[PDB]
Design a protein around this ligand. Structure first.
Ligand SMILES: Cc1ncsc1-c1ccc(CNC(=O)[C@@H]2C[C@@H](O)CN2C(=O)[C@@H](NC(=O)C2(F)CC2)C(C)(C)C)c(OCCc2ccc(CN3CCN(c4cc(-c5ccccc5O)nnc4N)CC3)cc2)c1
Lengths: 118, 104, 146, 90
């Protein structure tokens, strides 16, 4: 029950480098692939998303759980970013730009993470 | 390629259409059907320059570009009666009133 | 559940929106509840491959005046399911407006609605200028047709 | 085949019958054995000529597979054209 203590500053500095690379990423057309994923629609805007998508999460919440040390390792962070991307993929299905954007944001995450200078 | 003309004489204006490869003589046949005057009895103009039997409307400048259904091109018409040649005369349309200040 | 609505059929369908008109086109997607959703505009002559879904209603207006436009010569657009790997083409064109409607459009574009009634025209035309084109009025007429 | 349309200042506009029948008012005036000429003592030259241009534009681009262009109306004739259109029902 020492779950109060924060993550070591080097770990928080690492997570924020990865999630900033993902969110700031632009394709060769200068388009910010992550913008649609920053914040989820409201249940009244899009109830069909919450009917189907069952564990909802956006980058707003992901980068929140970094501030408050909910993720205890880089793997805990990857589990949500993959869940975010898979949520978008199962709701919109292949053939949609949002699907294919989340394919790429998955790739950027693993490139950004595989940059460990350690 | 359809071209859309506005054949004008004095205070008569004929609305008709032809093809860009249609001939000036072929307008004169269309005008003969409407005004009952054979091709020899009529002279077609495009801004003071006499038009030419045997020439296509495209070669006279009438294209899909310049003679559009919503903005037809003008062809001047003058008649010949035996030895008499009237001058080409096209009376102007009426002028519009000045804009109400509501718009301007 | 309105009669003019999109069906929540999770069946993807590629569609090519092509604005072949001189207007700035506002595509309007009809909700699953038949509610109009405005989508990003298209400059004149512009086209874009668009991902949509089978059984979804689409509608197209002038983005500035909400004048009604045509899609494949009809007012409504529904994508079929794509046959093999072939996008469905949506040709967006002007309609042949009545002479009266086109005049109303131009007078509406020059006279601000405050001065509609300052124009010295038959008073049955004041109310014609005030009947601005919008999506709900078209949905009402297009619905009652079926 | 061709019908005559006179303005208030005497200009004669000869158009196809199927073109002039675009107007509902003109359709009633015509064939109401059948009529070939119509006179309008309250529509000027610069309005009918533009009215007749709309007839050409309607018949050509109605049910067309082409790219439909905008019908142009200069500001100085919009009002007169509006009641001309309202009167002719077209
Ligand atoms: C370029 C261009 N030029 C002129 S028009 C145009 C253009 C055309 C199309 C699109 C995108 N395509 C669509 O929206 C198609 C069209 C129609 O069939 C309906 N539809 C759908 O996806 C529906 N989905 C479905 O029916 C299903 F998926 C169930 C099958 C819907 C609207 C999501 C209910 C576009 O896109 C740019 C404009 C545009 C369009 C819509 C929106 C608002 N959205 C709504 C919700 N959305 C989503 C967020 C997340 C999500 C969010 C945060 C975190 C994790 C997440 O998984 N996941 N899924 C979403 N659909 C965010 C923004 C914003 C911008 C631009």
């Amino acid at each position: 029950a020492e779950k109060l203590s924060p993550n070591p500053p080097k770990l928080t500095k690492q997570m924020n480098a990865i999630i900033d690379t993902v969110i700031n990423y632009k394709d060769s057309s200068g388009r910010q692939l992550s913008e649609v994923f920053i914040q989820l629609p409201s249940r009244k805007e899009l109830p069909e998303y919450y009917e189907l998508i069952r564990k909802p999460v956006d980058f707003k919440k992901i980068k929140e759980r970094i501030r408050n040390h909910k993720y205890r390792s880089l793997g805990d962070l990857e589990k949500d970013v993959m869940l975010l991307c898979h949520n978008a993929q199962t709701f919109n299905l292949e053939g949609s730009q949002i699907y294919e954007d989340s394919i790429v944001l998955q790739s950027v995450f693993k490139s950004a993470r595989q940059k460990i200078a350690k | 390629m359809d071209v859309f003309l506005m054949i004008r004489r004095h205070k008569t204006t004929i609305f008709t259409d032809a093809k860009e490869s249609s001939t000036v003589f072929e307008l004169k046949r269309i005008v003969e059907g409407i005004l009952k005057r054979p091709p020899d009895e009529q002279r077609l103009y495009k801004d003071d320059q006499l038009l030419d039997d045997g020439k296509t409307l495209g070669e006279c400048g009438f294209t899909s570009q310049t003679a559009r259904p919503q903005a037809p091109a003008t062809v001047g018409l003058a008649f010949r009666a035996d030895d008499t040649f009237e001058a080409l005369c096209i009376e102007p349309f009426s002028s519009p009133p000045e804009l109400p200040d509501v718009m301007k | 559940r309105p009669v003019l609505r999109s069906v929540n059929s999770r069946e993807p369908s590629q569609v090519i929106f092509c604005n072949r008109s001189p207007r700035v086109v506002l595509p309007v997607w009809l909700n699953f509840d038949g509610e109009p959703q405005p989508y990003p505009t298209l400059p004149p002559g512009t086209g874009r491959r668009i991902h949509s879904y089978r059984g979804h209603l689409w509608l197209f207006r002038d983005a500035g005046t909400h004048d009604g436009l045509l899609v494949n010569q009809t007012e409504l657009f529904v994508p079929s399911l794509n046959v093999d790997g072939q996008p469905i083409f949506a040709n967006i064109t002007l309609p042949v407006y009545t002479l009266k409607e086109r005049c109303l459009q131009v007078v509406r574009s020059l006279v601000k609605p405050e001065n509609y009634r300052r124009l010295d025209i038959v008073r049955s035309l004041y109310e014609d200028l005030e009947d601005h084109p919008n999506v709900q009025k078209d949905l009402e007429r297009l619905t009652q047709e079926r | 085949m061709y019908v005559k349309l006179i303005s208030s200042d005497g200009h004669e506009f000869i158009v196809k019958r199927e073109h002039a029948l675009t107007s509902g008012t003109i359709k009633a005036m015509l064939s109401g054995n059948e009529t070939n000429e119509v006179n309008f003592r309250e529509i000027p030259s610069h309005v009918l000529s533009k009215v007749c241009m709309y007839f050409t534009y309607k018949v050509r681009y109605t049910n067309s597979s082409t790219e439909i262009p905008e019908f142009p109306i200069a500001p100085e004739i919009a009002l007169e054209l509006l009641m001309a259109a309202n009167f002719l029902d077209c």
